[PDB]
Design a protein around this ligand. Structure first.
Ligand SMILES: [Mg+2]
Ligand SMILES: [Mg+2]
Lengths: 136, 790, 121, 68, 63
């Protein structure tokens, strides 16, 4: 219950106690799509194949980083709270019911490094939410 | 065969905007005509209403008011007077738009004591017009045209003694028909088509289910006729007064259902408007808590038969009634992103319906046969999170564009084959035989089990899921087989003929002109050029038949958005032939002449009210193949037969047309986001990235002008991008049951609230960014507008 | 028991039916959904043997499908389970009359055989 | 008084270890499966040769729902 | 928007007795999806129950 209270106006979204029961978080899956720099030597860089990563412009590569950084996920969606599956009902009450078993699978937010943010505007320290649905 | 009607299948979409030309839209007549047009207004605007008021005071209106007001104060008022108000009203031709009774009561209680009580009038009439239509979903009307033929050559031109009479008869059979559970042709034995591989039925990948009756407590055929709404009208080039198509439910308690409106201008073209989007139960307590089959409900969707008669001065008469000359009209939900084309379209379904799967390898491929798939997928980013941040092919396209390298894809030589295969190998094969392990071969337990990511049922089992070994192929949209976790047909695949084009492309088996290569440095350059080729194509009649359908979805079909699965079978057409490339050198998937098999008796057919007893099954479809069958009428459309399959009411079906979440958050599968978006870029964000740091406004991108110019240029651009990246659940762009303290929200409440809120959902419109800078935001963006949205 | 008019005149068409617990895919994994057990008693003992299986089959609940007994005169007595039905998760409610996923009960049926071994051989 | 009869079920002689202990028809069962099962040679005929659990598997799970 | 509500009806016979009829028992929500699931407290509903003040003025022939 300690999450978002929506108004008829979309924004800003009100939230009760986000510092402890987060509402919108940066998931692991996004962190693995902005943490790397273009000069990284791996087969896959920020979720792309080496070839694609190295082939784009520096400006484009960095923008893709900040788009990824900008994607926040409902904290309630970091585990199965009754909204998963064809015609799953979702909603507030199923959240309460499933939170009794699912509380232990909700994303945990932990500071993580961005070794070389270069020009992208992402800070050297980011706070990433970890959970199994999170992760890609 | 000397006169025909185009298009053969006309589409009109419901909207609560009024049924007049200036405040409505037209179904596209030329494909890709306005993809980037940043002046579109799909919601009725303040400007538009103000404009329509002023010409309503044209012109002897200011005068009768000054006059009436001198005749007024020789008395010294006060107010007006019935016959006095009954005077101004009805010099502003506005009773069409708003009830006479409500204009009067708007002036009746005005306060007055010259050219200045006009403003109090003009103003009070503005806000009733505004109360009704401000922000309203404009109606998309279908224009219907008579062409002279030798095979169409030129629109009919009327000379003074000539007239043309249209006649239209429509019906809704949703409440009469059967439940939609899945697509009956999923178990239908076939040789395979361009649309559907024979594997689906052959290897029992998504068995068709039996379907019981909607409103099953109405028994005997005679009484069930009350469940069918129908209406008809005529218009001729002599008049141009609009006619309503108005029925009743239940059929002749008792609601009036406006199914559409028809107009004809003096040149002889017919304009058809759909209804107002009104769906209702006979009893308020009857809630539409099912995606498709709700008893006790009617909606104002409709479809039916369009005919005409041409009468020349000399006295020759020409009846356009046979099925090669006639047309059809269907009404549909609104298109909430008219510039975002579905990846596979209903027109593509018509194209695929005429090919046999066995002969697809004799298909020839140009690059324009493959570019629609690449371009449409690229543009899904404006309505679907997965196609903006989770789609490795859209990122590779952005890579190419970032070095003006896109024309590499049009390279058919072997130095680009690695390039082409990498992109082709990410697509789902509509054979549905990749990424599967054959379970229990030979036993009745035989089954193709996907080893990719499944879409679970809501009916959960606390046993660990089998790990996926293969990767999820594109596109990431659910399909006709969703009801069966493990089935490969749970996920959408482009249809066999369109995957064949993609296969030839990968091989290097395709042609492309040099002039295409030189306009292909980015994907937007090439789509802009392909869009001019549509413009200048000489065959307007076949282009308007294609444009009517290229904005309709063509899968998945559960049941879909506008039409459903019978549209993918050649059986439903009386005629379906290729005639030519769009351009002599450029195919772009072709121009076809096609026509629906129609019951020439229309509302009067002995099969106007046919069914199959207590259930419908694939056996009744299998028996339909034989045209002397007592089932063959399924393919001979009488009015109301194309839309009867769809969800009743359609708002239920639209509220279910969204994300299907999987245990893995990403990517998020979505049904039909080109027409019912899932994640949109709201106006609120647009107003925080549209501006450059130098823009002349006291408030720039939501910051005070001071704050905005005080930050570095680097940081200012970054704040743009982050804002461009905030995509909003389309379902949250109005109150669909999640607003307020302790609101339940959830799936059902979305179905229930959409009956009233469909007209407030965010509409997507192209909008400009004049000065993107180095922000990475493109010059055209696609913004979702809604009252909650800003 | 059944007149051919039902089929012949389509009085109550058979509906297709989908799988229970459909998210369990492949025949190998679905074997986990079957609860089974077996046992033997003979006239020399008369101590009672429980027919006790597992669900899902070998989290994991013990399920007493029944109990068996032989007396000295050599008659088998067969007792059924305790009437215990349960879902793997307490939040899974049995809302349909017939088809609820995530549920097991201790009903069972099966095969009864015996060997008679006489004094002589 | 409606007579006394001697009757017995078809049985798979292999019981728990029958190869048809885990048989089914794929994603759905339909009457057409049942039609195929009539022919005692078909691959559907196991429907009538009971392995343990074949008589109760049809009923409501759990039975309490069915009784309510 | 804007529903009419018959709260009652009144008659007077020629001997001056007033007859008061209640309404027709119509209850309705402003939106059909507002269901009255609470025994007493449902928002968005109205009904045709009323109560109010009854008065008269007798005028005799003499004045
Ligand atoms: Mg904290
Ligand atoms: Mg669209």
């Amino acid at each position: 219950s300690c999450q978002a209270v929506y108004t008829p106006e979309d924004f800003p979204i009100p939230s009760w106690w986000a510092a402890n029961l987060p509402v919108h978080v940066l998931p692991l899956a996004r962190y693995n799509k902005f943490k790397d720099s273009q000069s990284a030597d791996l087969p896959e860089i920020n979720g792309m194949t080496h070839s694609i990563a190295q082939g784009m412009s520096e400006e484009t590569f960095e923008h893709l980083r900040l788009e990824q950084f900008s994607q926040r996920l409902d904290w309630l969606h970091t585990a199965d709270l009754g909204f998963v599956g064809y015609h799953a009902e979702g909603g507030y009450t199923n959240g309460l019911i499933q939170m009794v078993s699912q509380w232990k699978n909700m994303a945990m937010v932990m500071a993580r490094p961005v070794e070389n943010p270069g020009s992208s505007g992402i800070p050297n320290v980011v706070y990433v939410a970890y959970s199994q649905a999170d992760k890609d | 065969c000397q006169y025909k009607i185009y298009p053969p299948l006309g589409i009109a979409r419901v909207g609560n905007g009024p049924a007049i030309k200036p405040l409505s839209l037209s179904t596209p007549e030329v494909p890709w005509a306005h993809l980037y047009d940043t002046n579109v207004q799909y919601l009725v605007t303040q400007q538009e209403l103000e404009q329509l008021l002023e010409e309503a005071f044209g012109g002897n209106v200011i005068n009768e008011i000054s006059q009436i007001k001198t005749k007024l104060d020789e008395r010294k008022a006060e107010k007006f007077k019935q016959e006095e108000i009954e005077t101004i009203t009805g010099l502003l031709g506005l009773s069409h738009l708003v009830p006479q009774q409500q204009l009067s009561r708007s002036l009746d209680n005005l306060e007055l004591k010259s050219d200045d009580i006009v403003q109090q009038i003009k103003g009070a009439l503005l806000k009733v017009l505004s109360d009704h239509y401000l922000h309203a979903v404009k109606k998309q009307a279908q224009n219907f045209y008579i062409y002279k033929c030798d095979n169409p050559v030129e629109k009919l031109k009327l000379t003074d003694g000539d007239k043309v009479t249209w006649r239209v008869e429509v019906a809704n059979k949703k409440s009469f028909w059967y439940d939609y559970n899945n697509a009956l042709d999923l178990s239908l034995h076939t040789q395979g088509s361009g649309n559907l591989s024979k594997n689906v039925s052959k290897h029992r990948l998504a068995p068709a289910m039996t379907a019981k009756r909607r409103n099953p407590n109405v028994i005997t055929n005679s009484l069930r006729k009350q469940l069918v709404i129908s209406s008809q009208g005529s218009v001729s080039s002599d008049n141009n007064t609009q006619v309503p198509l108005r029925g009743k439910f239940p059929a002749n308690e008792r609601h009036n259902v406006l199914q559409g409106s028809i107009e004809c201008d003096n040149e002889g073209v017919l304009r058809f408007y759909a209804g107002n989007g009104i769906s209702q139960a006979l009893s308020p307590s009857s809630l539409n808590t099912d995606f498709a089959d709700n008893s006790n409900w009617f909606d104002d969707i409709c479809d039916g038969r369009v005919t005409a008669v041409v009468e020349l001065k000399n006295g020759d008469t020409f009846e356009i009634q046979d099925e090669q000359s006639s047309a059809w009209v269907a009404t549909t939900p609104p298109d909430y992103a008219p510039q975002i084309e579905p990846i596979v379209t209903m027109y593509d379904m018509v194209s695929g319906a005429a090919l046999k799967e066995q002969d697809l390898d004799n298909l020839t491929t140009q690059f324009s046969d493959v570019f629609p798939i690449l371009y449409r997928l690229y543009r899904m980013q404006w309505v679907n999170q997965a196609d903006f941040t989770d789609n490795a092919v859209n990122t590779q396209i952005r890579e190419l564009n970032s070095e003006l390298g896109f024309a590499q894809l049009l390279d058919n030589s072997a130095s680009a084959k690695s390039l082409r295969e990498g992109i082709f190998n990410q697509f789902r094969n509509p054979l549905f035989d990749q990424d599967i392990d054959v379970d229990d071969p030979g036993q009745s337990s035989n089954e193709w089990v996907s080893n990719s990511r499944i879409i679970p049922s809501k009916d959960e089992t606390n046993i660990a899921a089998k790990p996926a070994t293969s990767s999820l192929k594109l596109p990431f949209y659910p399909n006709d087989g969703i009801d069966y976790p493990g089935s490969p047909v749970q996920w959408f695949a482009i249809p066999p003929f369109m995957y064949q084009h993609l296969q030839n492309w990968a091989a290097g088996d395709f042609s492309v002109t040099q002039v295409e290569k030189e306009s292909a440095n980015t994907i937007e350059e090439l789509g802009l050029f392909y869009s001019e080729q549509f413009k200048n194509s000489p065959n307007s009649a076949l282009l308007c038949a294609r444009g009517a359908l290229d904005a309709l979805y063509g899968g998945g079909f559960h049941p879909g958005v506008e039409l459903t699965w019978p549209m993918r079978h050649n059986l439903i057409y009386s005629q379906n032939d290729y005639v030519s490339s769009v351009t002599p050198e450029i195919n772009l998937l072709g121009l076809r002449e096609f026509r629906l098999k129609q019951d020439l008796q229309g509302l009067n057919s002995p099969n106007m009210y046919q069914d199959f007893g207590h259930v419908i099954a694939v056996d009744n479809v299998t028996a339909s193949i034989d045209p002397n069958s007592d089932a063959a009428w399924l393919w001979r459309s009488t009015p109301g037969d194309l839309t009867k399959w769809m969800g009743i009411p359609w708002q239920s079906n639209a509220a279910s047309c969204q994300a299907v979440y999987t245990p893995e958050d990403f990517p998020i599968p979505s049904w039909w986001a080109a027409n019912l978006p899932v994640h949109v870029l709201p106006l609120a964000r647009y107003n925080k990235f549209k501006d450059s740091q130098s823009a002349d406004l006291p408030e720039i991108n939501g910051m005070t002008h001071s704050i905005a110019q005080g930050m570095s240029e680097e940081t200012f651009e970054h704040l743009r991008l982050e804002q461009f990246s905030q995509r909003l659940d389309w379902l949250h762009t109005a109150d669909l049951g999640f607003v307020g303290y302790h609101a339940e929200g959830g799936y059902t409440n979305g179905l229930i609230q959409m009956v009233s809120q469909w007209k407030n959902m965010a509409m997507v419109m192209a909008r400009p960014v004049e000065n993107p800078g180095s922000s990475g935001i493109p010059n055209v963006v696609y913004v979702a507008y809604s009252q909650a949205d800003k």
